[PDB]
Structure formats: C-alpha cells, structure tokens
C-alpha cells in the first residue's frame, strides 16, 4: 500500500503533466496521496493563473463575516457576525491596520504558536464564499472555473442526468481568519489555489481515521452533539493540534504559500487559518472514486448546515432513503 503513514505529499508536475487534470489526480492517488486527506501541488514554473493582480480592488465583499470565538484557546467554536459590505481594496486596508495586522514573528512555527495562544481573544473579519473566479479565461491548465462538473461526473459514472451547476468561490482572508473542522459537502474533493498574499496553514485527519476525530468532537462539544448527529457540517468547531495530540488523533499539518494548490480528498477532515491578507479560490470536484463516499456521507438534518441548490440532486440520487428527512432540514 502506498503512503501507509498517511503523510501529506507534495507534487511538482511538469508543464506536460499539467495538461490533463483528471489524469494527474489519478496519478497522485496511485502514489497514495489521498491517504493523507490533503496534498500540495506546486505548478510548473512556466504556468500562471493570470498576468497580474493589480486590478482586483473593486471586487465587492457583500457580507464580510466577523468570526467571534467562544470556549478555551484549544477548544472553541466560532460564530459569524454579518458586517456591512466593503470592497477588496477596503478589506485589504482593514487587514493591514494596527488592530488586525499580522504580529511580529520569527517563522511560521512561531506564528502558529501565537495563533493557538491568542486566536480566541480577537474577532478577525473573513470575506468568504464569494461566487467568482480570478483565473484568466486564457489559462488552459488547472483553471478552477473550467473544470469538469460534478453533475457531469455523476452522469458519466451512473447514467443519471441531474440539474445543478458547480462554480468557484473566492475567499479574502486576514490574520487569524479561521476555517473550522469539516469535510466537504457530500464528502467531495476540493481544490484551493492561493492567488496572492500571505500563507494559509492547514491541518488534516487521514480519511481512514475520520471517525476518531468525530468521536473526539462529540466529547468536546457535547451539547452540539446532542443537537445534531452531524454537527461538524455546521463548520463552527475548532480543536488545536495540542488537543489532538493529547487525545491521540492522527493528523498532519502544512503551510500553503501564494502560487500553490491544495487538494482535499473525500472524507479528509481539515481546518486552518490565514497568516495575513490573502485571496484564495476554491471549488468542489468529483472523480469515480468519490461516488462511494458520496453514498455514505453524513448529513445535517437539524437545519443549521443549509447548503446549495446542487446538493439536492446528490442526496436524491445517492441517498434516496435520507432524501425526505434531509430536505425537511433544508425547508
């Protein structure tokens, strides 16, 4: 078995190998990359997402989210308070202000220490889940706005035509902005490209060990657990690496820098934080190997997780018994 210790793998495709997206994902899996839950892909040196970022300041962040924490430094939840709209240029100025900017630090490890020590005492503002793309339309390779769609994959594998569309989302981050422990909707893959700015640190649990994370989460968030049988779908809970280590949960960590892709694999729990002002783009995708994960994916039916139009069809076709109760949650 390849990559039996479930380490995060880093790949360096040539421009020739960067032509066929599906093929390269299958290659990475042939080397065991999926076992980690997360992989890094460094694009060929000749490749670019677009010519410059000089003209992005007038993108609107219609609903910036202030991420307010409750709990203890290593075990907390966050809620998102909606703020007034601002442009990317306004947000970047805010991120660089004395109140919100990255503190002085020695290296990524020192900054990681400061994050876990101090995150709960601040409420950074996140521009998340903004439909759109920063890839130039002429970028032919690994353009996240030109991927094959999950509906087309399901149709190719299973023969059923379904409604729904699949488009990318932009994320504008600042120091301490946080992504809670989650897997993707319907335990899909994701791909994330860091277009610009400061790094993003990731934590991930191997798919084969995901239930160990879930059992810890039920112990650490006991009222949330009683409220919903899949409360990590709410995307609100954080657990530090120190706490994971104290409880024997297998995980790995890596820092993504501007110009790099990350791929998350089906049922790979992940969480993380941004180091400073940055912009990422991400989208879900599927392969044939995903279908079995989609069939088995947990669902939130308490009503909190409330997700896309396109997830309907996935539940209806892959999980017809759940369909009924899940849609009661979504209506």
Ligand X SMILES: O=C(O)CNC(=O)C(=O)O
Q: Which residues are annotated as a binding site?
A: 126, 182, 184, 192, 200, 228, 234-235, 270, 300, 302
List the one residue from 120, 300, 315, 318 that touches Zn ion (CB under 5 A): 300
**Nearer to ligand X (CB atom), residue 202 or residue 317:** 202
**Nearer to Mg ion (CB atom), residue 55 or residue 138:** 55
When asked if residue 58 is in the footprint of Mg ion (CB under 5 A), the reply is: yes
Residues 6+ apart with CB under 8 A from 159: none
Q: Are 271 and 76 in contact (CB under 8 A)?
A: no
CA gap 286, 266 in Å, rounded: 9
Q: Among 74, 72, 14, which residue's Cα sits nearest to residue 41? A: 14
Cβ at position 270, least distance to ligand X in Å: 6
**Nearer to Ni ion (CB atom), residue 92 or residue 178:** 178
Q: What is residue 82's three-state secondary structure? A: strand
| Region from 8-16, 50-58, 178-186, 209-217 binding Mg ion, contact rule CB under 5 A | 50-58
**Nearer to ligand X (CB atom), residue 83 or residue 316:** 83
Cβ at position 105, least distance to ligand X in Å: 21
Rg of the chain taking only CA atoms, in angstroms: 19
User: Which residues are annotated as part of the binding site for Zn(2+)?
Assistant: 228, 234, 300, 302
User: Assign residue 159 a region: left if phi > 0, alpha if psi is -120 to 50, beta otherwise?
Assistant: left
| Region from 26-34, 58-66, 189-197, 293-301 binding Ni ion, contact rule CB under 5 A | 189-197
In sequence order, the β-bridge partners of residue 87 are 60
Strands 270-274 and 200-204: antiparallel
Strands 9-11 and 38-41: parallel
CA gap 95, 103 in Å, rounded: 12
Residue nearest to Ni ion (CB): 190
Of these partners, Mg ion, Zn ion, Ni ion, none, which one is at the site of residue 69 (CB under 5 to 8 Å by kind)?
A: none
When asked if residue 228 is in the footprint of Zn ion (CB under 5 A), the reply is: yes
Of these partners, Mg ion, Zn ion, ligand X, none, which one is at the site of residue 304 (CB under 5 to 8 Å by kind)?
A: Zn ion
Binding site for Ni ion (CB under 5 A): 190
């Amino acid at each position: 078995a390849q990559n039996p210790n479930c380490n995060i793998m880093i790949f360096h495709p040539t421009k020739e190998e960067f032509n066929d997206f599906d093929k390269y994902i299958a290659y990475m899996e042939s080397q065991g990359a999926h076992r980690a839950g997360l992989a890094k892909i460094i694009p060929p040196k000749e490749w670019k997402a677009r010519e410059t970022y000089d003209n992005i300041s007038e993108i609107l962040i219609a609903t910036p989210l202030q991420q307010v924490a409750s709990g203890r430094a290593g075990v907390f939840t966050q809620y998102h308070k909606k703020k007034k709209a601002m442009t990317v240029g306004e947000y970047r100025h805010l991120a660089n202000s004395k109140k919100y900017q990255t503190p002085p630090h020695q290296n990524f490890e020192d900054l990681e220490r400061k994050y876990w020590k101090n995150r709960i005492y601040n409420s950074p503002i996140y521009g998340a889940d903004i439909s759109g793309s920063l890839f130039d339309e002429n970028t032919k390779q690994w353009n996240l706005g030109h991927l094959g769609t999950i509906q087309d994959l399901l149709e190719k594998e299973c023969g059923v035509v379904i409604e729904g569309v699949n488009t990318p989302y932009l994320y504008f981050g600042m120091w301490k902005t946080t992504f809670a422990w989650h897997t993707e909707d319907m335990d899909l893959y994701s791909i994330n490209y860091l277009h610009l700015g400061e790094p993003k640190t990731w934590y991930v649990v191997p798919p084969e060990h995901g239930q160990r994370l879930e059992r810890l989460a039920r112990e650490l968030f006991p009222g949330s657990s009683r409220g919903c049988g899949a409360f990590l779908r709410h995307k609100v809970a954080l657990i530090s690496p120190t706490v994971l280590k104290e409880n024997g949960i297998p995980f790995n960590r890596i820092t993504q820098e501007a110009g790099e892709f990350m791929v998350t694999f089906p049922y790979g729990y992940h969480a993380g934080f941004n180091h400073g002002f940055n912009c990422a783009e991400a989208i879900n995708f599927a392969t044939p190997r995903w279908i079995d994960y989609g069939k088995m994916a947990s669902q939130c039916s308490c009503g909190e997780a409330r997700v896309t139009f396109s997830m309907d069809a996935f539940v209806r076709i892959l999980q017809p018994e759940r369909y009924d109760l899940w849609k009661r949650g979504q209506d």
